[PDB]
Amino acid sequence: RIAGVDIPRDKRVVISLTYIFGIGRTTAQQVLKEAGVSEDTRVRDLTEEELGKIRDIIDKLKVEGDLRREVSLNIKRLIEIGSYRGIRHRRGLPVRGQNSKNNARTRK
Amino acid sequence: QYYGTGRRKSSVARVRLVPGEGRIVVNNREISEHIPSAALIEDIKQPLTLTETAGTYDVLVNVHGGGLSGQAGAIRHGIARALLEADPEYRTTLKRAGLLTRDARMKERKKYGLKGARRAPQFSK
Amino acid sequence: SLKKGPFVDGHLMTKIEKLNETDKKQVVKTWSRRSTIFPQFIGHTIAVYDGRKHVPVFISEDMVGHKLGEFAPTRTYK
Amino acid sequence: IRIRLKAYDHRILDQSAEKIVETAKRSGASVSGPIPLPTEKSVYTILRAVHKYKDSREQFEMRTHKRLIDIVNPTPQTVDALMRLDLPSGVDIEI
Amino acid sequence: KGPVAKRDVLPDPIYNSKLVSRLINKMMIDGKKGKSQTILYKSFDIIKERTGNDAMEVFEQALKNIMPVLEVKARRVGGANYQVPVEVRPERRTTLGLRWLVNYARLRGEKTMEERLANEILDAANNTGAAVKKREDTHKMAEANKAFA
Amino acid sequence: GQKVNPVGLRIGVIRDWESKWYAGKDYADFLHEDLKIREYISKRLSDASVSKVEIERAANRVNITIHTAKPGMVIGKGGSEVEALRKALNSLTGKRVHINILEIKRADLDAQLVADNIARQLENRVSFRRAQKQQIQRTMRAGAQGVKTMVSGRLGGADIARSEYYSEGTVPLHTLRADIDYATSEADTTYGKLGVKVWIYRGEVL
């Protein structure tokens, strides 16, 4: 697959492409705005000239590994420079600014 | 040419009966144009159906305020009182079928300390 | 903030321009946790007040975009 | 010509109602009726206890009702009469 | 105290009955008439079609395989857990049939309740059905506990 | 939680206001300038036994009606005492203050001054026994269809504080046609701080 990980062949055009890491719903709409494929066809049933225009737009964006690097780069950045928000990423506690006596069960 | 007013659940209806054929026009809109759910379409027609007044009077409607079932609910009182003006004979037939009450079930006010005007919030022990 | 520039206090901009003009020198007890970090601050060590002491911290080429309040542990835990 | 009365008490206002109307009628000013208007009112809610008892409230409501006066003709004899009007200050006449 | 009855609204646009509107008052999740009415009139159109009959004669004949004869009330003496046979009023035959309709209808599991309710009625018209045994097991509770009155 | 103060339960329906004007742009700062008036006039004229004050904001005029039951302590010469009043208040307000004084007939029927006389006798070291029953017979012989007095607190004793009735006649707190004067007044004693609740039923309206 273009992302290196598949889309299911029977879903619609927008939502199958949202399984691509880094690509959500509104990122899919900007691509298909440039593609112009009406967004409701079987993605088992396309042409490659149609899908070659799908490829190079994905080639233009931070999609597969690059978006996996740079946030993990930022995690490795801010922890190793102190930077208290680094410690909240570090210990297993919330980051964005919350209390602590309450639930916070996404991180312990 | 008979006239009436209609009030039910905080909304105002003005009903006047010109001699026509049964067409009901709601502030230059129609019934299905303005009110879906044909349950209420036979319900707004209920004062028209008991007395033999089927295809003989067109209705001008001034719906003001409120929501749809309260709006249409105001008309099904206002149709009656406007058609009370025609003949007071069948008033006794209508009054035994209700339809003249102006239902006093206004939405009650929220108490302080209670959520939904009768609901106590919760309880512990 | 968005477009007013990164916020500094007048005393912070004063002594660091006295620091940058000649030579890097002793640490500075700031009471301005609130202030940002400018790219001129790199290599300047300063003392941030934590609530009960001024903790000395370092500024490098990576600790640039944030404020000074990222380096003030005010709530110690175990 | 637009004159608006807005007060707190229905006893004072209705007593002060014809004080403008009938006296301006004496010089023939063609004054409209004392038209009422909806009451801009307000609700204050305050805990009845000193310290505890958030769920036991003590509501207080402030009502300011108002009635309207319009005059068609100028009639400058009434302008001297409207200037010399002497009322209890709860009504706060404004022209 | 004493007996206190409540009110009800007569008509029906289609299938001009009284008890059908009581079923419209059933499955009214959170105050939605027409959202349940959209479920209802689409169902009976299939019921008129999928079985080539008038849906009224399908409806109450299915109800007769649901409408019970005996309730069971109780009696606690120590820990004996006694039961009481109860004659079901002609009020309660109308009411408790609707509960045993709609609860098991939405619990079966298909695409929409347009399809859940429609095949449930045929499972009570042709009375081989899951909700029909709910009537039957109460008789099995009534047949054992008959001895008391 | 005990009985609601029956003045404010009757204010507006039967009993008129005291503060009377209309709110424009300054309705907070009308009150502060007027609450300083009532604290000033109760300061200097507590000895003069001034009961109640009504205030009119009268378009750069301040009209104060005064209820006392004697002018002879309050006007003095007639010109002497009232000029010291208006000179102080015009300095306190910053604008004109017009002063009029109304005498109260039957001084043993006004709740602000009937309760005040008890607190004078308590600070003069008189026990409650002779206190309340003398006060009630003043009110009953003056004409009153019901009088309820109550002094609550330490009785000059050591610790065990308690409320104490003495009342006669009809006190209809829940007939909404009342005309009931109600006021309280504190008392500074040697063994603490006595409170006095006194309210008088005068007769309802038909």
Added chain:
Amino acid sequence: AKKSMIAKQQRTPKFKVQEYTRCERCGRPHSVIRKFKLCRICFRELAYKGQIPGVKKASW
């Protein structure tokens, strides 16, 4: 801290955000009303002596 807390509100603070509310009769924060500049308890006992010209009991 009472009379300084009356005084600090009646001074000029370092910034206009550091204005707060205080009722000037029983001076405490936590609900001084903006319209009256009066406190939560001090609204009530002053209402029951014929004062605060508008407010009566509430029932509708």
Added chain:
RNA sequence: CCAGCAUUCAGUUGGGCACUCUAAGGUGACUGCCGGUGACAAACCGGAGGAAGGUGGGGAUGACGUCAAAUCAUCAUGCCCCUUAUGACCUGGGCUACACACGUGCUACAAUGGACAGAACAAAGGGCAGCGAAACCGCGAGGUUAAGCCAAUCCCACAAAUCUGUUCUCAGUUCGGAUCGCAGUCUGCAACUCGACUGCGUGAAGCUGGAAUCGCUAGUAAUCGCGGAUCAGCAUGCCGCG
């Protein structure tokens, strides 16, 4: 407010006090009256008329006292205690910590749903350094300038659920929306601890919850939005409204 009367993109221009509505004064319901009941009394049962029938629905109103129930931290406060400090002022921190239990609240675990589009419908409250239209620009939160409004005139404010199409097809998914990254906007001296809200991404836990418990007699149960106090700023909070 708009029926009749034309003019109108439009109650707009006229014009009008009908109707609606506004708010002052009456009026009406009292077991008054009919029948039956018991005693014939009170009162009960039924019927009539009537907008309304048995204290019409609701509010406000809470007897004597109970618990030495609550508040010296609203105030007042006797007594005790403090005083170059237990008083006053400033910065900054903290009241927001978190291995873990508990109440109390919302958003959900979906097909009565999700997504998009169309159509239509409220009540009450608020606005002077206060609301800010329209307009333009930003994907947007908004920015820009700015009419009008001290207000039934102008603005907040285009209500949501609803209805009708389209698409979705039963799975941890087109449900979920936390958690978290980056990019932003506002207010304010200043948003790091410690604000709200968008924009992009990320997409867990959970697929009706054990013993046990809680609310509710008719516009209530649940459900959906909106207004306001409080405030520079901030609500799943509480009032209040349909």
